[PDB]
């Protein structure tokens, strides 16, 4: 399926990043999403958003330029930013340094998404 | 091939191009002991050895004799070059 | 027809698109030959 | 505007120290056949 | 000169004997025609009629048995006159004659001018029927010839008395060292023997590096060595870097011309190097770059179809100064010529070519004559080192002292085993060394003729 | 040939693209005429050793020959008096004891880090059993199943697993036979080589034929592990290349497996279409009067695996613990940005990385990537 | 078309051997499995592309085989594509090429699909540069500057601060009504064994050949290689001596040869 | 119109293209499609395949 | 395969030329020029005018000289 | 004369002012005996006043 | 995520997130020829040693 | 010599009964090379037996 | 990281002198310093100061 | 070798690097003096 | 120490130069011991990864291909 | 250099070039030892 997985030498080796494709958007899919799990119980995602460690990187927002220069992002979207920092550990899922290189880089795009979320929430009420 | 000439004993064959300033270009073939001697034969035994300062030699390349038959060297100075 | 912009002072022949000047004679390239002025 | 002979190709019928290189040497003074 | 020699790698060898490396050509070849005979064996001249007029058999005499039983070979005009061979070669001594009829539907025959001596013939294919087909065709191979080089053994010697063991230098003038650079550097070591073994490893670095670079093989055309040592054996010298590089791409000149540097770096790498592999980087002197700058300047002045603006070449740049409100600067240089079809030429001015201590002939345009020499060391990639420094595995230089009661170098007072009875200590050091250039056709040089070859 | 090199390995990981891995294998196919090492004999010297044990006398080995028809009035009969000596030693190696157990080397050395990782395990086992047990019916059964693991230790759990893997696969694979054939390769070559990798998701061990492994770039090491570049060349079944590589072969590549025409594209043809004449020259240190084609007359496939140590840029990062004033060190890849204003200092290192590749036949380029089993 | 090969012998050379002797100033084991599989690989490459038909207009073959059956040989790529839009020039001129490409495109093509890729040799790419350069030399209405063409650009060099370069190559010409004529080099036109007539401007005179395959769009391939389903290549070993027989059937097909235009020098004809 | 120098920078008659043959590869070609006469007159074209 | 022959020829309408072959008799040196020369497609253009053998014991001397003037074209 | 030279050096290279420098000091392989030697140099000084 | 291996007859259940990839794998087949006119059991071998 | 077997990259529908019979008319009267890569010849083994 | 350490032979050997660099001063830092430890619990150091045995 | 891009019609000698045009002549700078053509 | 941890090797006796021992049967009495070997390029980077400069990685990288 | 560079030094004068001059000496003048309790290398190599 190639999305965040390396299916070589007979086995299914992953780094944790969950590329969720083939669904469609939340309005295009009749189930309003993918429903990856029952935990909120309807955890719904779309064709673009990507999950690492139960944190969903949304594909609908964009990258503000003040949030781009600090934390040093590469993509134009928060989902596309996590789709670039995993490119080392996509081909090396079992490495000790690429695991630490992934968990550190996914924590930056996590805290970059929350600062864009908190700034949008503060600007909407104002 | 120990005939008795200056560079180590063997005969050396050279291909020379030039451009006679104000006159034109040409080809030249010579046996010489040095490539300096090859351009001193054009200034001595050439066509324009009287006006010896007009010889502007631009290439002096050696021919090595092959074991068997064949065209060794060739040089054309065409009219549209001149 | 053919416009020439350059006049060269050379004992050898210039390029075909430039006018030859040498010691008192002028030549210009026309129809594959060097046509003199006089 | 003229060539000069840099190689000649003859048949075999027209005819141990140390090795500098262990593989063979393809010279530039040779035509190479074209697939 | 030593920085230039360390830009080449080093190979390790087992012996000091001769070494050989074997070069190879292609397996594909066309064969020149000797003679062509008609149906009954009568040779065809140029003022004759056509030969294979009604798909009638005729002959082709070739100077070597190269073609096979049922193949199709072609003349100078491929695919227009296809010649199917009939039967194996009948050997007229060393030659080979084939029975041959036309193949590609030709019902008028081959003209008599297409069957002369000198015409080349190459194999295309060996067709058969669909039904009951018999064996046709053959397979050809190719062979290696060898190249050859050997080694060169140098030596040094210096002698001091045994009085100079710990002779302190009361420096009236400060004692200086000779550097490898040529500079006299100052030193402050008060002992004399620090300036004795430093000038003998200065000098041994100068002896090796002139033997690796500047070599003169003294093997004769009859395979003999005429220069004999003091003991009676032959002093054998192997070629250096600057003798092995000139054996294939010999080129000499008086007047530099760019049209012969560009049409000879394209003749040798015509369809053998790819479009990205034709970067030819010229090593030259400082004055060889000024001569190269003028000839590109003379070349782009012949490009009259283009005009060369100030706005792009920027030969008159604006500068700021107190003398004027809009003050100008001036100066330009041509350092790169891009030939048609991917061939580029770049200048690398190296300080090795301008050394006036070894280079003594002056050029008429100033500077030493060795500055105007253009060397393209590396043409393409080779998959193995083309130029390398042959060094023997295990032959560390024998530091060797014979001495008497004192040794001023090692500093030994009292000797149990005496060579002789005098206050002396001599150094003897010697190195067996050579170089090897595998493909001197991958290296194009351009030498001024005033160096006299 | 006539143009290649080994590609530059001091690159960032983004520049090691699909063609760069393909250039490494196309270089590996060049070095198949050659097998030279500092602690190995030649392949001809090894292959003459085996055929003395398989009953072939090569008459060009014991003398100068001044033949090729197999008749003792012009040849020599061979009498296998060496086999009965080596068959004692491989009959005894089977009968020695095989109790190869993972042991804790210091079984009374329990640390706080070994105490922390044990508590993370039993908390994770406690988190599972609340989900599996449905409202106290077998929660008291799952509790007593893990209560006896409170007296275990972390080195005991890791020794239980490491023995539970080895006890199964010695009895499945018949690993005692593998080392018994590999002993026979050691009294004949002097070289006993084994490969362990993952195929089909399960681990496997196989003895490498010493006539088919090229151990490059070692440092007079007795060990084979210390090499930088190993090429395993063999002729596989077409079923084995789908037994191994089914999950990475494209539908283009299974048409080359099915219909397999002769090719010259394997580095013989250059970019300017020149054909390379030094490919059709096999050596005489590698073959003789007793290898590069993609397939065999038995209908097999040539499979060429290259294992090379590429170089990887990593970063050594000094940070501080927030709670205690203790400096700490970590290793991060080159795509890690250091969080300054935390005292975070960085130094960049270049570091080995085990890469692999596989060329099946002439077209099929498979598993050109960093080797996913890094013996870290 | 059906081709066969053999070799009477195993790794060693035999009676057909050649040596290559280079001219410098001071003047293994053959893998017979690989030369037969290469010199039959090139027998099929010459049969597919350089093939000749030996049929009448009556259907009869003219050349018979060793068994009395007729040798069936079909035409190659360079004989099927040399039946239409093929010209033989003595001197190259853009007056002939910009007009032959236009009348082929004034009567066959819409104005958007007029992209003509000249597949030519290497020395014929220099011949295409110099004759566009003489065409630009006569465009005296527009003066060409270095600001647009940039034949003299600035590169960074150690020798001088303001250090220039030189060099350019015309590789395209855009005739009126949108005839865009590109250029690339096939390496097989500089074939030194096959091409024996030498051109006076350097090369092998087959490099000076311009071939326009792929005229327009078709909705299918025009030129392709034919093959028999299953496995049409054979092999065989006849033991005495050992004769390595091989046999194969092949074919090429040009559906519309009026959709292929070629320029051949007139020294390679008749 | 020799009163105006018509340089190549404004018309882009010869314009740079990217090919594998050369790092600085050039093209050629142009076509006059329109002629604005004096006093307001423009002359455009409409090339029809009907003609 | 015996001697060496240096030739001065004149290509008609194009210009002059100098050449050197290795042949047994000087008619064969014209054969190795008319068939292996650069004007192979126009082999009738060669009009050879002087052939002389490389006689070694001078070993310092010109063997062919041929200039092209500005008034010949 | 090394380099294998048989016909000698011309007399126009052996005039007054022709400069000569050390290249290297070659010996044979079997049973060599001592060659070559080592050179030294020294500096100068200057002066001033008031 | 969980992985399953289905034959080509199985249609992909999209809109629930199923991504598919198509592999070619081995299959043990069997057949018997008795005499020359009897052809029997030409089928996949029914003991699949999976 | 090559083991020319029928085409196996088919869908399961196109493995019809003539295809299975064509795969099984590949085993009748075939002659091959006498000894395989790891096994001696049959005329050798019958001499031993 | 070269500050008071000797990272050699694959190991990290120190003499205890801790070079607390690369952060910045107490004023230009957002967290008022580097905050190496919690003991006064906000124990702050800057880019210039150096500690040995918890003495700055 | 010495290009003269411009031509200046003037009764005085205009410049070294321009071609002087008078009534019935056309002079240019050579050998340090003005040489007329024809 | 190699790789942070202790390691033990046996030394090839032909590839060790023991200087300045005073007629002593041991080797630890020596004042100057030089071990010259031909290490692999992978063992240079195992042992000296933290002390090689990026210039020195290039010299390991630009070494000529003697395979 | 003459001998091994002066070891009777203060620790601050053992700079980057003092250590390199020591190590360059081992590259050059350390091949020939009159070992007092060892055999020659050519003698030991014959034994192996
Ligand atoms: Mg056509």
Numbering used by the authors:
A (entry chain GT): 425 to 463, 466 to 552
B (entry chain Bg): 21 to 102
C (entry chain Bi), N (entry chain Bk): 1 to 38
D (entry chain BD): 2 to 16, 32 to 51
E (entry chain BC): 52 to 504
F (entry chain FJ): 2 to 67, 72 to 295, 318 to 403
G (entry chain BD): 203 to 211, 213 to 230, 243 to 455, 475 to 504
H (entry chain BE): 354 to 404
Direct quotes from the study:
Virus ΦcrAss001 (Kehishuvirus primarius) was the first representative of this order to be isolated in pure culture from human faecal samples. Here, we present the characterization of ΦcrAss001 using cryo-electron microscopy (cryo-EM), enabling de novo structure building and elucidation of functions for around 1,440 protein subunits constituting the virion, leading to the identification of a novel ‘crass fold’ in the distal part of the tail. The virion possesses a short non-contractile tail extending approximately 44 nm from an icosahedral capsid. The extended tail barrel formed by widely conserved paralogous ring proteins has a high capacity for storage of cargo proteins alongside the capsid cargo zone, ensuring that the proteins required for the initial stages of crassvirus infection are carried inside virions and delivered to the host cell.
One vertex of the capsid contains the dodecameric oligomer of portal protein gp20. The 12-fold symmetrical portal oligomer sits within the 5-fold symmetrical capsid vertex. The localized asymmetric reconstruction of the portal–capsid vertex (obtained without imposing symmetry), determined at 3.60 Å resolution, showed that a loop at the peripheral area of the wing domain, residues 268–319, is flexible and can adopt two preferred conformations (types A and B) in interacting with the C5-symmetric capsid vertex. In the type A conformation, residues 277–290 of this ‘capsid-adaptable loop’ are oriented radially away from the portal’s tunnel axis, whereas in the type B conformation residues 292–306 of the loop are arranged tangentially to the portal’s circumference. In 2 of the 12 subunits of the portal protein, these loops were not resolved in either conformation (denoted ‘x’), resulting in the A-B-x-A-B-A-B-A-x-B-A-B order of the conformational states, counting clockwise if viewed from outside of the capsid. The result is a pseudo-five-fold symmetrical arrangement of capsid-adaptable loops around the 12-subunit oligomer, assisting the formation of optimal interactions with the five-fold symmetric capsid vertex. The gp57 dimer has approximate two-fold symmetry, reinforced by disulfide bonds between residues 47–47 and 25–88 of the two subunits.
